[PDB]
Amino acid sequence: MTGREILEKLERREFTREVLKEALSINDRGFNEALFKLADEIRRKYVGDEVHIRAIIEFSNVCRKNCLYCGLRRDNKNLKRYRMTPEEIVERARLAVQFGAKTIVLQSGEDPYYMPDVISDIVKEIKKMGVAVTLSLGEWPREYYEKWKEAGADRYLLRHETANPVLHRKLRPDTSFENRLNCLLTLKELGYETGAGSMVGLPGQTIDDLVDDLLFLKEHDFDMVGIGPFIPHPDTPLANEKKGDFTLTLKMVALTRILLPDSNIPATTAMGTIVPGGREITLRCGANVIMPNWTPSPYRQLYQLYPGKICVFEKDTACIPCVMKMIELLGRKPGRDWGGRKRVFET
Numbered sequence: 629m630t631g632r633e634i635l636e637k638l639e640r641r642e643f644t645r646e647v648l649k650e651a652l653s654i655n656d657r658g659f660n661e662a663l664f665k666l667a668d669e670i671r672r673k674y675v676g677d678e679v680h681i682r683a684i685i686e687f688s689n690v691c692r693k694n695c696l697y698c699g700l701r702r703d704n705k706n707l708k709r710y711r712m713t714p715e716e717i718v719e720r721a722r723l724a725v726q727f728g729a730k731t732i733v734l735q736s737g738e739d740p741y742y743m744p745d746v747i748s749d750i751v752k753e754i755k756k757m758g759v760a761v762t763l764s765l766g767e768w769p770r771e772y773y774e775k776w777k778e779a780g781a782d783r784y785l786l787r788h789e790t791a792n793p794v795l796h797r798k799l800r801p802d803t804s805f806e807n808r809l810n811c812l813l814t815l816k817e818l819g820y821e822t823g824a825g826s827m828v829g830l831p832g833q834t835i836d837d838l839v840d841d842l843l844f845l846k847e848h849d850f851d852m853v854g855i856g857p858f859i860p861h862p863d864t865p866l867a868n869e870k871k872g873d874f875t876l877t878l879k880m881v882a883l884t885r886i887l888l889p890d891s892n893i894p895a896t897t898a899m900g901t902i903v904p905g906g907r908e909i910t911l912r913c914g915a916n917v918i919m920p921n922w923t924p925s926p927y928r929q930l931y932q933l934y935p936g937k938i939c940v941f942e943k944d945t946a947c948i949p950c951v952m953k954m955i956e957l958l959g960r961k962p963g964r965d966w967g968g969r970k971r972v973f974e975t
């Protein structure tokens with residue numbers, strides 16, 4: 629179809645596989661800009677001008693899994709491993725709340741040391757501060773997810789990475805897409821606000837795979853969707869592969885907003901790493917959430933999912949003020965509440 633015809637169908641919410649594939653296959657600048665403008669408008673209409681700040685504390689880089697893309701994979705001996713103590717984590721979260729953070733995100737490698745009871749105790753302490761808590765700890769038994777929900781966790785970010793089961797198993801040899809999806813369904817059933825999302829430009833991933841990622845996100849109606857480019861890490865088996873394309877990833881963000889108009893969608897760290905100013909662009913093409921790095925030195929530099937990760941060289945209180953300045957210069961507004969999903973029921 630022509631680009632104009634594709635945009636017309638997107639505006640009429642006729643989200644067929646062919647429409648999504650054509651949107652991802654057209655590279656015309658005029659089409660792309662019109663797609664970004666549509667997503668920006670849908671974002672404004674459904675979720676408004678507030679940009680929600682989620683302060684991330686990457687509290688351990690120990691991991692039991694061996695994902696082929698990830699710098700924290702267990703086979704990487706070229707990385708100093710660290711673990712923050714529970715007291716350090718709680719006090720670091722307290723500092724973020726003192727700086728105005730309304731959500732605390734705890735993210736780590738799949739580090740067994742904390743699971744499940746240390747996490748539960750940390751969550752209970754942070755919840756006393758009157759903020760939302762999001763966990764991003766990987767794949768664990770239902771019993772652990774249950775304990776963390778009873779302890780007060782509000783949300784769970786478990787990006788699905790890729791909806792292609794063959795590619796998923798090759799890149800994540802300890803597990804499977806089937807288990808990842810089961811974890812996501814369990815999280816939803818337990819009442820978490822649940823986040824999924826994929827990487828764009830993985831080795832062997834096709835445009836059809838990206839369409840499947842979009843249809844997967846639409847099918848399950850996730851509360852949050854985290855999308856970013858694949859960034860090769862020199863100490864992994866994918867060191868020599870090509871990085872994901874920023875524009876194609878941006879189109880995935882924009883189409884996700886169009887498909888899931890009331891969802892929460894971050895402008896990911898990876899988007900800011902791949903292109904200078906990438907997060908600001910993404911906030912203008914469908915995203916409405918930003919997640920400043922709140923990991924303290926000397927650990928911030930060691931959470932090396934991929935190289936070149938932004939904000940490693942800044943003072944460790946720098947990122948919350950920085951994103952507040954970013955939101956203001958974008959003409960946007962601070963989030964006033966926890967920024968939970970506000971469902972607009974449609975037809």
Ligand SMILES: C[C@H](CCC(=O)NCCC[N+](C)(C)CCCS(=O)(=O)[O-])[C@H]1CC[C@H]2[C@@H]3[C@H](O)C[C@@H]4C[C@H](O)CC[C@]4(C)[C@H]3C[C@H](O)[C@]12C
Nearest residue numbers: 660661662663664665666667668669908909910911912913
């Ligand atoms: C800032 C630059 C180009 C600068 C420019 O060229 N214009 C700025 C003011 C100049 N004026 C036209 C007002 C004066 C003309 C008189 S003059 O004689 O000086 O030319 C423009 C050109 C293309 C624009 C992006 C695309 O749309 C896609 C997307 C749409 C979303 O919704 C918002 C985000 C995003 C990324 C846009 C952001 C921004 O907006 C861009 C980069």
Ligand SMILES: C[C@H](CCC(=O)NCCC[N+](C)(C)CCCS(=O)(=O)[O-])[C@H]1CC[C@H]2[C@@H]3[C@H](O)C[C@@H]4C[C@H](O)CC[C@]4(C)[C@H]3C[C@H](O)[C@]12C
Nearest residue numbers: 722723724725726727728729730945948949950952953962
């Ligand atoms: C942590 C220390 C010491 C005092 C303290 O421990 N303060 C707790 C505040 C708790 N809250 C944020 C929930 C209050 C919000 C009240 S508010 O009126 O904003 O709704 C206080 C003293 C001055 C405060 C900064 C400045 O102000 C400027 C700026 C305002 C933004 O906005 C938030 C970010 C920033 C950088 C502030 C961060 C932080 O806060 C500072 C460093």
Ligand SMILES: Nc1ncnc2c1ncn2[C@@H]1O[C@H](CSCC[C@H](N)C(=O)O)[C@@H](O)[C@H]1O
Nearest residue numbers: 697698736737738765766787858859933934
């Ligand atoms: N090389 C790379 N490039 C871009 N993103 C990467 C990456 N390696 C890992 N990531 C992203 O980092 C995210 C958090 S990894 C930490 C949380 C948890 N261990 C988990 O796997 O869910 C992953 O979901 C993945 O999408």
Ligand code: SF4
Nearest residue numbers: 691693695698701737
């Ligand atoms: S993506 Fe998550 S589970 Fe996989 S190696 Fe990295 S930290 Fe471990």
Ligand code: FES
Nearest residue numbers: 939942947950951
């Ligand atoms: S958000 Fe980290 S220094 Fe700007």
Ligand SMILES: [C-]#N
Nearest residue numbers: 894896897919
């Ligand atoms: C992630 N931001």
Ligand SMILES: [Fe+2]
Nearest residue numbers: 854896897919
């Ligand atoms: Fe993230």
Ligand SMILES: [S]
Nearest residue numbers: 939942946947
């Ligand atoms: S930062």
Ligand SMILES: [S]
Nearest residue numbers: 947950951954
């Ligand atoms: S920033």
